[PDB]
Amino acid sequence: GTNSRRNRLLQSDYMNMTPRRPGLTRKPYQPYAPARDFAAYRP
């Protein structure tokens, strides 16, 4: 028991529940979705 946690865990907090979402993304997802219907089947 006893308080005074001290030396939590050198780097990387115990972030109860779960560690902050890991980025690991970088660069845009560039969805790129060429749609262009047909402008109302244009007469």
Residues after which the chain is discontinuous, using a C–N cutoff of 2.5 Å: none
Experimental technique used to determine this entry: NMR
DSSP labels, 1-43: --S---S--SSS---TTS--------S-----------TTT--
* Residue 43: HSE in the Cβ half-sphere, 13 Å Cα cutoff: 0
